[PDB]
Every structure is written in structure tokens, then in C-alpha cells.
Design a protein around this motif. Structure first.
Motif, PDB file in Angstrom:
ATOM      1  N   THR A  50       0.772  -1.245   0.000  1.00 20.02           N
ATOM      2  CA  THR A  50       0.000   0.000   0.000  1.00 20.02           C
ATOM      3  C   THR A  50       0.806   1.301   0.000  1.00 20.02           C
ATOM      4  OG1 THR A  50      -1.779  -1.126   1.221  1.00 20.02           O
ATOM      5  CG2 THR A  50      -1.854   1.281   1.129  1.00 20.02           C
ATOM      6  N   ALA A  51       1.730   1.448   0.943  1.00 21.65           N
ATOM      7  CA  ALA A  51       2.493   2.691   1.039  1.00 21.65           C
ATOM      8  C   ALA A  51       3.251   2.953  -0.255  1.00 21.65           C
ATOM      9  CB  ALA A  51       3.461   2.648   2.225  1.00 21.65           C
ATOM     10  N   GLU A  52       3.917   1.916  -0.754  1.00 18.27           N
ATOM     11  CA  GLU A  52       4.679   1.998  -1.999  1.00 18.27           C
ATOM     12  C   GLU A  52       3.818   2.344  -3.221  1.00 18.27           C
ATOM     13  OE1 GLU A  52       6.031  -1.690  -3.392  1.00 18.27           O
ATOM     14  OE2 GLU A  52       7.538  -0.887  -4.771  1.00 18.27           O
ATOM     15  N   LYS A  53       2.750   1.583  -3.429  1.00 19.44           N
ATOM     16  CA  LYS A  53       1.852   1.807  -4.554  1.00 19.44           C
ATOM     17  C   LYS A  53       0.633   3.974  -4.014  1.00 19.44           C
ATOM     18  CE  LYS A  53       2.304  -1.597  -6.346  1.00 19.44           C
ATOM     19  NZ  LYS A  53       2.875  -3.950  -6.646  1.00 19.44           N
ATOM     20  N   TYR A  96      13.921   0.688  -0.537  1.00 16.68           N
ATOM     21  CA  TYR A  96      13.188   0.700   0.726  1.00 16.68           C
ATOM     22  C   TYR A  96      14.094   0.274   1.866  1.00 16.68           C
ATOM     23  CZ  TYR A  96       9.557  -0.381   4.230  1.00 16.68           C
ATOM     24  OH  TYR A  96       8.779  -0.429   5.360  1.00 16.68           O
ATOM     25  N   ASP A  97      13.916   0.917   3.012  1.00 21.56           N
ATOM     26  CA  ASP A  97      14.608   0.535   4.228  1.00 21.56           C
ATOM     27  C   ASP A  97      13.582   0.129   5.280  1.00 21.56           C
ATOM     28  OD1 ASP A  97      17.030   0.398   5.946  1.00 21.56           O
ATOM     29  OD2 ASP A  97      15.962   1.971   7.038  1.00 21.56           O
ATOM     30  N   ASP A  98      13.464  -1.165   5.562  1.00 21.53           N
ATOM     31  CA  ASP A  98      12.432  -1.633   6.482  1.00 21.53           C
ATOM     32  C   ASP A  98      12.702  -1.196   7.922  1.00 21.53           C
ATOM     33  OD1 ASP A  98      14.502  -3.343   7.331  1.00 21.53           O
ATOM     34  OD2 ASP A  98      13.546  -5.172   6.602  1.00 21.53           O
ATOM     35  N   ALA A  99      13.972  -1.020   8.274  1.00 26.24           N
ATOM     36  CA  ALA A  99      14.309  -0.566   9.619  1.00 26.24           C
ATOM     37  C   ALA A  99      13.646   0.776   9.943  1.00 26.24           C
ATOM     38  CB  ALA A  99      15.822  -0.463   9.787  1.00 26.24           C
ATOM     39  N   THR A 100      13.589   1.673   8.962  1.00 27.41           N
ATOM     40  CA  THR A 100      13.026   3.008   9.189  1.00 27.41           C
ATOM     41  C   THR A 100      11.704   3.230   8.456  1.00 27.41           C
ATOM     42  OG1 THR A 100      14.401   3.900   7.396  1.00 27.41           O
ATOM     43  CG2 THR A 100      15.229   4.082   9.635  1.00 27.41           C
ATOM     44  N   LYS A 101      11.188   2.156   7.868  1.00 29.28           N
ATOM     45  CA  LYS A 101       9.960   2.203   7.080  1.00 29.28           C
ATOM     46  C   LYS A 101       9.987   3.376   6.111  1.00 29.28           C
ATOM     47  CE  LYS A 101       6.504  -0.304   9.777  1.00 29.28           C
ATOM     48  NZ  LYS A 101       7.537  -1.138  10.451  1.00 29.28           N
ATOM     49  N   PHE A 140      10.897   4.788   2.177  1.00 32.67           N
ATOM     50  CA  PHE A 140      11.185   4.653   0.760  1.00 32.67           C
ATOM     51  C   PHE A 140      12.037   5.819   0.288  1.00 32.67           C
ATOM     52  CE2 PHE A 140       8.482   1.139  -0.527  1.00 32.67           C
ATOM     53  CZ  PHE A 140       7.570   1.070   0.506  1.00 32.67           C
ATOM     54  N   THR A 141      12.896   5.567  -0.688  1.00 30.96           N
ATOM     55  CA  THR A 141      13.629   6.654  -1.313  1.00 30.96           C
ATOM     56  C   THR A 141      13.542   6.506  -2.815  1.00 30.96           C
ATOM     57  OG1 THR A 141      15.182   6.810   0.546  1.00 30.96           O
ATOM     58  CG2 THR A 141      15.823   7.857  -1.506  1.00 30.96           C
ATOM     59  N   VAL A 142      13.208   7.598  -3.487  1.00 33.95           N
ATOM     60  CA  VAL A 142      13.289   7.619  -4.934  1.00 33.95           C
ATOM     61  C   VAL A 142      14.402   8.580  -5.332  1.00 33.95           C
ATOM     62  CG1 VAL A 142      11.429   9.332  -5.029  1.00 33.95           C
ATOM     63  CG2 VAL A 142      12.108   8.099  -7.105  1.00 33.95           C
ATOM     64  N   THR A 143      15.311   8.090  -6.163  1.00 29.84           N
ATOM     65  CA  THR A 143      16.495   8.853  -6.510  1.00 29.84           C
ATOM     66  C   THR A 143      16.613   8.986  -8.021  1.00 29.84           C
ATOM     67  OG1 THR A 143      17.779   8.365  -4.515  1.00 29.84           O
ATOM     68  CG2 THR A 143      19.010   8.856  -6.520  1.00 29.84           C
ATOM     69  N   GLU A 144      16.692  10.226  -8.481  1.00 31.71           N
ATOM     70  CA  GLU A 144      16.735  10.519  -9.907  1.00 31.71           C
ATOM     71  C   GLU A 144      18.163  10.616 -10.426  1.00 31.71           C
ATOM     72  OE1 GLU A 144      14.604  13.711 -12.966  1.00 31.71           O
ATOM     73  OE2 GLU A 144      14.652  13.977 -10.777  1.00 31.71           O
TER      74      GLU A 144
END
Length: 56
Positions: free
Chosen positions: A25-28, A45-50, A52-56
Motif C-alpha cells: 500500500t504505502a509503496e503503490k 526501501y529501508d524496512d528498519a526506518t519504514k 522509501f527513497t526515490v532517486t533521480e
């Protein structure tokens, strides 16, 4: 839980959170949020800190 998104665009940078039942859900939500902000990039994604990072 609170999930987080770091937007590391080339010049546009920001962050947002969403409350979601799972990280699916969070991702979509986030993969809509980045594409509102016109930031197409590579996704991690980093599950430890919940977080997401998007990098251009």
C-alpha cells in the motif's frame, strides 16, 4: 504504521509520510506521489526506518 518517502530528485527534494496497513500500500501511495511531483527515479526501501527513497 507511518511510512516515509524521501524524494531525491535532481533538483526537487522533499519528503512525505503516509499511514498505511502495509509497506504494498504505502509503496503503490508513494510510487502516485513521486509521479504528482514529476520525479521518475530508482526506488529503494529501508524496512528498519519504514522509509522509501526515490532517486533521480
Amino acid at each position: 504504521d507511518t511510512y516515509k518517502l524521501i524524494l531525491n530528485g535532481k533538483t526537487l527534494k522533499g519528503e512525505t509520510t503516509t499511514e498505511a496497513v502495509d509497506a504494498x500500500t504505502a509503496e503503490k501511495v508513494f510510487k502516485q506521489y513521486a509521479n504528482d511531483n514529476g520525479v521518475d527515479g530508482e526506488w529503494t526501501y529501508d524496512d528498519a526506518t519504514k522509509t522509501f527513497t526515490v532517486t533521480e
